[PDB]
Each structure stands twice: as C-alpha cells, then as structure tokens.
Amino acid sequence: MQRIKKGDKVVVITGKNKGGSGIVLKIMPARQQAIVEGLNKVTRHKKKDQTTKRAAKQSTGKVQQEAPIFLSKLALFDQKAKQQTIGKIKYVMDPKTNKKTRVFKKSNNTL
RNA sequence: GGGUAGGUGGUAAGAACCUCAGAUCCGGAGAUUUCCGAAUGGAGCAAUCCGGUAGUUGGAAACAGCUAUCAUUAAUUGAUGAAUAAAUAGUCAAUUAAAGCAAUACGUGGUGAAGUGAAACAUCUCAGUAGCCACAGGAAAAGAAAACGAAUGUGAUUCCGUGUGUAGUGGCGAGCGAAAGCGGAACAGGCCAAACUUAUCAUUAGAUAGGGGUUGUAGGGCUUGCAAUGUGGACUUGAAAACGAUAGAAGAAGCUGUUGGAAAGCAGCGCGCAAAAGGGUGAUAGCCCCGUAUUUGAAAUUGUUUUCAUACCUAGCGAGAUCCCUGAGUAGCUCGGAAAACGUUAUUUUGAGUGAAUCUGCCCAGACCAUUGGGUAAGCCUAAAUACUAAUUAGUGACCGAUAGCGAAACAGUACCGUGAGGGAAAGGUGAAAAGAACCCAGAGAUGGGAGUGAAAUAGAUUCUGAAACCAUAUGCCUACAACGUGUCAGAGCACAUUAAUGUGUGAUGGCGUGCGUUUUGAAGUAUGAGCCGGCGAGUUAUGAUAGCAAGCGUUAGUUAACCA
RNA sequence: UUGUGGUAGACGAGCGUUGUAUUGGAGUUGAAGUCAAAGCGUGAGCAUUGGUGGAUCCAAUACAAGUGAGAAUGCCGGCAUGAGUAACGCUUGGGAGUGAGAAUCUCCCAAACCGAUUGACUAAGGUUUCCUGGACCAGGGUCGUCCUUCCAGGGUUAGUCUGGACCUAAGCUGAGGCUGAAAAGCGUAGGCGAUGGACAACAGGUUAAUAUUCCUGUACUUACAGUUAGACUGAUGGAGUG
RNA sequence: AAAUCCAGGUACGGGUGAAGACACCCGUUAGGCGCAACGGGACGGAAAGACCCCGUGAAGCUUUACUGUAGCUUAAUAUUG
Numbered sequence A: 001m002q003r004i005k006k007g008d009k010v011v012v013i014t015g016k017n018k019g020g021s022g023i024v025l026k027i028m029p030a031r032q033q034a035i036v037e038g039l040n041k042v043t044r045h046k047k048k049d050q051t052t053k054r055a056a057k058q059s060t061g062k063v064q065q066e067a068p069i070f071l072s073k074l075a076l077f078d079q080k081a082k083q084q085t086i087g088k089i090k091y092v093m094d095p096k097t098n099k100k101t102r103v104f105k106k107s108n109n110t111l
Numbered sequence B: 001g002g003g004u005a006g007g008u009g010g011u012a013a014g015a016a017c018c019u020c021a022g023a024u025c026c027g028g029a030g031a032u033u034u035c036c037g038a039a040u041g042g043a044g045c046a047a048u049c050c051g052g053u054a055g056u057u058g059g060a061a062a063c064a065g066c067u068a069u070c071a072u073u074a075a076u077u078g079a080u081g082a083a084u085a086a087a088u089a090g091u092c093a094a095u096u097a098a099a100g101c102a103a104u105a106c107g108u109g110g111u112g113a114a115g116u117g118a119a120a121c122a123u124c125u126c127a128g129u130a131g132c133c134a135c136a137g138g139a140a141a142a143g144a145a146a147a148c149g150a151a152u153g154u155g156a157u158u159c160c161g162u163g164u165g166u167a168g169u170g171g172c173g174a175g176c177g178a179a180a181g182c183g184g185a186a187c188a189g190g191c192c193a194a195a196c197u198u199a200u201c202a203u204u205a206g207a208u209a210g211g212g213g214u215u216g217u218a219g220g221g222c223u224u225g226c227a228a229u230g231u232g233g234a235c236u237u238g239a240a241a242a243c244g245a246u247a248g249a250a251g252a253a254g255c256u257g258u259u260g261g262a263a264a265g266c267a268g269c270g271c272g273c274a275a276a277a278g279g280g281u282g283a284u285a286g287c288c289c290c291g292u293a294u295u296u297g298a299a300a301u302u303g304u305u306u307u308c309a310u311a312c313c314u315a316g317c318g319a320g321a322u323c324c325c326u327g328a329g330u331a332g333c334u335c336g337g338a339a340a341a342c343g344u345u346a347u348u349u350u351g352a353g354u355g356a357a358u359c360u361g362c363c364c365a366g367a368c369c370a371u372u373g374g375g376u377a378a379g380c381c382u383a384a385a386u387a388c389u390a391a392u393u394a395g396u397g398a399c400c401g402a403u404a405g406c407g408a409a410a411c412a413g414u415a416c417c418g419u420g421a422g423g424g425a426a427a428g429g430u431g432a433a434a435a436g437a438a439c440c441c442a443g444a445g446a447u448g449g450g451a452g453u454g455a456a457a458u459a460g461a462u463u464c465u466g467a468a469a470c471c472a473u474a475u476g477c478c479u480a481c482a483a484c485g486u487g488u489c490a491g492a493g494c495a496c497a498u499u500a501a502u503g504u505g506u507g508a509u510g511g512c513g514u515g516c517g518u519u520u521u522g523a524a525g526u527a528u529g530a531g532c533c534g535g536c537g538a539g540u541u542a543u544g545a546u547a548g549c550a551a552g553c554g555u556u557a558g559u560u561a562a563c564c565a
Numbered sequence C: 001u002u003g004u005g006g007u008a009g010a011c012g013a014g015c016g017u018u019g020u021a022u023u024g025g026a027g028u029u030g031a032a033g034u035c036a037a038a039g040c041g042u043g044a045g046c047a048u049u050g051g052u053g054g055a056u057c058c059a060a061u062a063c064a065a066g067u068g069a070g071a072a073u074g075c076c077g078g079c080a081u082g083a084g085u086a087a088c089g090c091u092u093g094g095g096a097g098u099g100a101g102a103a104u105c106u107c108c109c110a111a112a113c114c115g116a117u118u119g120a121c122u123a124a125g126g127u128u129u130c131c132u133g134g135a136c137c138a139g140g141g142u143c144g145u146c147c148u149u150c151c152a153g154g155g156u157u158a159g160u161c162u163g164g165a166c167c168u169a170a171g172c173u174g175a176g177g178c179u180g181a182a183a184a185g186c187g188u189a190g191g192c193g194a195u196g197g198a199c200a201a202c203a204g205g206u207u208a209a210u211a212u213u214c215c216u217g218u219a220c221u222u223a224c225a226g227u228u229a230g231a232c233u234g235a236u237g238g239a240g241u242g
Numbered sequence D: 001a002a003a004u005c006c007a008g009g010u011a012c013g014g015g016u017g018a019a020g021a022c023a024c025c026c027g028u029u030a031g032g033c034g035c036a037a038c039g040g041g042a043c044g045g046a047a048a049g050a051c052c053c054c055g056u057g058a059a060g061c062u063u064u065a066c067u068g069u070a071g072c073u074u075a076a077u078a079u080u081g
C-alpha cells in the first residue's frame, strides 16, 4: 500500500511551513509529490492569450494555486487520539476482512 | 497470479474520458501479427506488378468480394512411360527434411600470401598468420596403444607447471624448438566385420532379417560340464519429493534550540540495530521517506538433483578338440611432396606405379640385421576437466568524467562527403520549487530599463563556475629633432599610499646591449621551426638475464610453480 | 684546508599533480575553482587578505601512476594581422501607393537587350521548388515591407496520353546439364529486357493552382450476356503479310 | 575575404661578421601619422629542390644478369587389347 493517500489529513515536518495541516488533493506516485490544499501557494504571473473560444476571455490575474510537495516532508495526522500527534504507521492485516490497514506505532489507532 | 487508488507513453499544459463489479502497473501463458526480405505462384528496378487451381457468396455472364493452396533440391513410396520387346532414362503425384541469419567471440577442414627480419637476398623467417570458402556445436576437436620407452617401469584423450630455452634442428646464419619423466585438474570405457548357426529370396546369394563376438599375461567360434540370477550404465517412460528461476509481503529506532531562504550541519538530551549498503528529501540524516539485514510467499511456465517402479544393455571359473575366424588394392616398396622441434628421416600422411603374410602370424624399440622385450594397423561411438561472451540478474573498480570514456551521455553510424564500396563529426549542467518576469516606459517589434517572484536576477531561458589570447572605456605618468631584440644599471620631475617595506605607478636623461629552440667546426642569421592563447601530445607493460643497494633464512642450505581452501 | 664555467654524458638530493591506506582537522558564520595585491623561500614552489563562487577540502607518514609542455610545416577550439583592404560574378528613368523605415516591394508610363531566342511544348533529371495568406531568426555577396527562404492551408482526376495487363533486339537470368580445390564459370528449354513493332478522341470552355484526364458537344475500341438473321467451325501447328 | 606573420618603436655610407646586415663598430641624415602611385630590398610569398649527390630506398622497363615458372615440345609409365 502507500504511506500517503488522496484525502487523509497531512502536515509538514520540514521547510518554511511548519505544522501546516491540510488535505491531500492529489498524489503523483512517479515523481513522489503530493498536492495539499492551502499549502505551498505560488502565484504565477498570469499572462493573456487569446486564440480559443475560452481564451477569448481567459481572465487570469494573480491566481494563487497549489505547488506539489515532496512526499518525504509529509506526515500523517492522528484524529482518534485525544491528544493528536504525528507518528509513523504500520501495515497490519486484520483477519476480520483480510485487508491491509495502516495503524500507527506510537498508539493503536487505525488509519 | 501479484498489487493497489490512481490512469489515458516523452518533449505536455489544457480538452474529453476511464477507474473500488478492483483500473493503470509487474510476472507467467496465449490471441492478432500488413508488405519486402532464405522469399519459395511468375516477374522485378525491395517494400511493387501480373496470376493459376479448388471452394463459397452476389451477377444474366464477363467479373467482383471472402478463404486455402501453388518454388527448387534430396530421400522414400506409388502411377505412367522413349529410342527398342522387356527394362531403364524421363514424366507426374503424395509424405518427410534442407535452405537463411548472427555472437566485430571460441572449433574443425580446404586454400593460402605479402610488408618485415636475416642490417642486401634467393634457402629460411614472417606463417600455416591475414584473407577467401565449407560445416557446425553449445562447446568443438582428440581419444582407449599394431603406444611410450629402457625399466623387477607407466597403462585412453584433454588442459596447467616443470623438465629448458635442454636433446636437437638451422645459407649451423637470422632463428626454431620438442618427445620422455615428475607434480596437478578430471577420469569411463563401450560397440560392429569375420568365423558358427536360423529363416527367406527362379536360393546360381556372393543378398535381407535374427542368435553368437569384440581380443594381447592372445581372444572368439566347435564339443562337454559346474556356478549364476545378481551389479552396474554414457540408458525409456511414468509417479513422488527437495533445491531454485521468472511478480511480490512484512521489515526497528528523535525531539528541542542556534546560524541560515531552507538543517539533515552545530550543540543538548535520548533511542534502535541479524538493518551503519545505497538513493531522495530546500546543505553534510543510523532513527523524514524508499529501501537494506532477517523471516517469508507461486495460480502458470521452466531448470537441477534425489527416491521408487519400469523398459534396453550389462556376468565367473574349468575340460577336450589341434580344427576354423580375427578388418587387402591394406601394410610394405619405388618416384615427387608434406606432418612432426627437424630444412624430409627411423615414425605419420599421399598424387602416380607395384604389391604381401595369416598366432611358429604381423608391427614397433631413429638407417639395417640377429637376440630380447612391447603392442595387436588396415571398423565405429565416447561425458569430465579445456576455449569464448553478443545477451539476462546481482555486484566491483588506488578505471574515464564531455579534447577523457565505445566513433556515438543529445534522436550517432545521425548530419555530411562519395556513383559505389567506403569515410565520418560536433554538441551535457537555470533555480529547492517556473514561482520562466503580470504590469509601466521607449521602440514597429524583437529587446532594453523599472516593477514582481526568488536567499541570490551580475542565477532570466545567451541560463553551474568563467582563464588567457582578443576588442573597447577611464584615474595617474610619459611621448611630435627622433636611429629603437624595446630591456638593464643609474636618474630628475610628476601622482599616490602598501602583505611598512632603505614603499608603489610612469620614466626627461646618461652608460651598456644583434631573440628562443634545432642542427652544426662555426647561426643576430641573407639556414631552419613557431601568428597569438588554452587544452591534448612522446621512455610503458608482460616474461626472462646481469649489476648496485636492502631485508628474510643459513652451512647437508635457500625457495616453491601449477593446483586445493 | 682545498674547492664551486660547462654541452654529450655519469652520480646524488628534492619539488609538484591525481588517487588509495592509516591517523587528525576545516567548511552555507562559506570548500574547491577564479581574479588582484606593494609577501616567503637556493630552485622547482609555498602562503596571507579581499572580490567572485556555491560544496567539498586540508596536514603528516607510506604506496600506485595515463605525473610535469614552448617548439614536432604537431591535433582541436577560439581570436588577432593583412583590413574595413581586394571583391560584390553582362540591364535604366520617373509618377502613384503600402509601410515605422523604399534606388531594391506593388501598379502605371516609358527605356534598353533577346527574338533559330532570355520566346512556347515536352523527354531525362530535380522531388513540392507549384497556388494563396502571413513573417522578415537565419540564407539572398548591399537593402528589403520582398523572395525559388520559413510558417499555415491547399494543389496532380484517363477504356483512347506516357508505360504495364501484348511482342521481341543487343544483353541478362537460367531447372536439368557441362566444367572447376571451395566460392563459383559456361550454358539448353523457359523468363526478363525499348532506345523499336501492334493498339480506340477530337474541338471548345472552366479554377489562384489540373486538364486529349474535369464540363459541353460529337465519336470510336475491346470484352460478356440475352436476342434476330445468315453461315460448318476451323489452332498451341504450316504459309503469306508484318 | 586571402595567402603571410618569433616580439618590433623597422634610415643611409664605409667596414665587420656563417664569407652580400633595418638591428653589430665608426660616421651621416631624419618632426608625429596618413593617402595615391612604381616595384629596388626585406637572400619577398606560394611548393620539407623536380637538377646533383647520399640511402646496402621504391616503382616501371630491358637483356646471352641470377634463380624459378605459365605455355610449347620429347620420352617412360597407367588407362591399354
């Protein structure tokens, strides 16, 4: 399975942004990146191009979007625990459904 | 089958979809596989053209779709059948194999030079090398003594060390150079012909298909008995098991503060280890991530080994007879060549000619004869150790790091050159992240100057660092009566202030002064080589000999080579 | 105390580069590289500071070398000198327009050369160079708003034309076969091979680009089937013509 | 653009010198820098002299040079009575 999936809450443990909590919107496995909403906001200088029916307007000024972040800098966020903390996960297989599930190693919380 | 939550190959954003009834992706097994090309229906200027035959569907037929088949050679079988009665030649049909390619590499065989050396050259060497051709194989070749060879000897072949640069062979010149023996790697021996016998061929068999046999301290057959039912194979089918190969699963351990754009660096306090190999993460991370040590797992295909059964092959010691068999245009010999270290010679081989004997036999022990001894030619097959790497997996390097390393880090045998064979380049790096510069000004625009992002824009796509030659700008000094290898020793004036040093920059003027390498008796040279700058560019390696120095071991010393771990 | 010029040459002692092995050390508070300066050594050489640069490097003792560049009419790359010099490879003037910019682009009027040709149709070859619009990185021996250059789109219509589905010449290939160490050479029957032979379409119009091809008009030729009438049909071979 | 180019700030007379000097010795002359000319010199440039000699160099050709050989011719022997 994968350490980080599309949807789970995640934070950053290195860089200028420390303790930045967000939801992963998209994962590129090949480039080992991850788009997390609200984090790594870059503002491309949006030019103007008019060669299509939609390009006739293409209103784009200082649109701030999301820049991808290396998957190593991401860490899963705990929610079930009363005191939330950042830890590592296991890949135990519970015989109830025989499906692999991530479980933290500093607690006993699933996913 | 594995495996998930993403995917629709790269320059690549966007549009539109697919995907949790399990996608994309990885592995095993299959399906489809246009045309040229051995190309093989016929042709042809390769990727084109023109068909025949037998089916089937439309048409009223020509015709048009959709299928299968149609080359040549060799072998077997059957049919037909000339000159010419029979019979062959030939013709036709059916079945089975062959064609070709590549691994710039190893094997075998045929053919086979020259440059060069001998300080010339012809014998010789180079060299049975290059090249040309044929046939393979996963290796090939060789192979079980008519042997070595001098002994109370060894007992297929192959490969390594030594014997040794020895015996020898050489216009006895340049050179060439074994075979024994010894030490090792591996080890395996089998099977036909003839006798004798069985059955069948107008049985003129002298032919076909079986039993019997495979030799040297001779063997086998003929007749007559004892003992045997085993051990082992280079061996067929199956069944079972084990070890693997082709995807994978799990896989421990960290926070705080400081400089910093960013920590993983630094410091403090800790933790894990059968994991401190490696890669990435904004700098230099055992504990951030992927992994690694370790434990594991295969539906399907495939490799090795073992066990059981099952085919095939595989078996000893006597007696008598005194009879038969033991590989012929063969061994020898003569005339021309060659192979072996030998430049032809005892041994091996052959183009021409001739030509034997049959265990009281034949060959050999460097001409040859006799004695002694060794071995059984003229038939075949043979694993292992040995040679090599185009390719697949893992990994290593006192190997290279864009003039280096493969010619080719990029889309390189490309661009390009030549009718053709053939020849054959250069060219890598923005930033952590494109956040690739919206917007304003000048301009026609590219572009430039600001703004903005960024730690850095003198990192801006001309994109890591940016040297010299070369071209321009400027502070300071000098220079327009001056004979100059352009410098050196003195020396005013001018302008500054340093790796603080009897300082630095320029140099009115005085004295002296014909470059650097090469090759020459002798070069400023009217001898030669260099336009300048930068990179590259020429005493090495392997095997031996001598001598100097030093160390280890020493007076029945010293030291191993191959090979094994 | 005696000495210390020196080529060929002999001997001895050292420096420097890259990497490896052992020790220690420095580095985003800035390493290598790289530039400058008024330093230290007997020599190869070695430091200090500052600028640029952005991640490795240094000292000691040993070891191994693709280990030292000024010359080879040396190789490669760059840049000078000659020198803004020679040369720019046969053809004039003006008006109007476009354009930011015009001797060079567009149109018009002349002018000058070709006129058995610089005119028109095609074979061979070339392979999109053809037409339209746009552009002025590069190429055009100047310029350029323009080009045979570049970008985007488009363009080649056959029963009768040129060649196959027809035929052969020189010649090539060639089952069998002959010859030859091998590869192969020769060659019969067959099969290819035009630059030749046989074969049915002419006139006009149309698009920016095609036209005996598309359109209009009028024709012709060869096959197959049905049908009507007549006739016995007569080749893979012989002969004539070709 | 081009060949060329050791660096140049590149006079003349007599002498000297590797024997014919822009550069040496002794004298004379000459303000700095161009442009258009013409070729005296720079033993000017282009071509590692083709003439000559040397090399125990190469190649082509010749012959009663040497050694061989294709081919031609003669004999023995086998096919061969």
Ligand SMILES: [Mg+2]
Pocket: none
């Ligand atoms: Mg599946």
Ligand SMILES: [Mg+2]
Pocket: none
């Ligand atoms: Mg010779």
Ligand SMILES: [Mg+2]
Pocket: B117
């Ligand atoms: Mg010689």
Ligand SMILES: [Mg+2]
Pocket: B119
């Ligand atoms: Mg010689």
Ligand SMILES: [Mg+2]
Pocket: none
């Ligand atoms: Mg064999």
Ligand SMILES: [Mg+2]
Pocket: none
């Ligand atoms: Mg895993």
Ligand SMILES: [Mg+2]
Pocket: none
């Ligand atoms: Mg882990």
Ligand SMILES: [Mg+2]
Pocket: B285
């Ligand atoms: Mg690390």
Ligand SMILES: [Mg+2]
Pocket: none
């Ligand atoms: Mg003999």
Ligand SMILES: [Mg+2]
Pocket: none
């Ligand atoms: Mg020999």
Ligand SMILES: [Mg+2]
Pocket: B359
């Ligand atoms: Mg005997």
Ligand SMILES: [Mg+2]
Pocket: none
């Ligand atoms: Mg003897």
Ligand SMILES: [Mg+2]
Pocket: B376
């Ligand atoms: Mg015998």
Ligand SMILES: [Mg+2]
Pocket: none
């Ligand atoms: Mg290269």
Ligand SMILES: [Mg+2]
Pocket: none
């Ligand atoms: Mg380069």
Ligand SMILES: [Mg+2]
Pocket: none
């Ligand atoms: Mg070409």
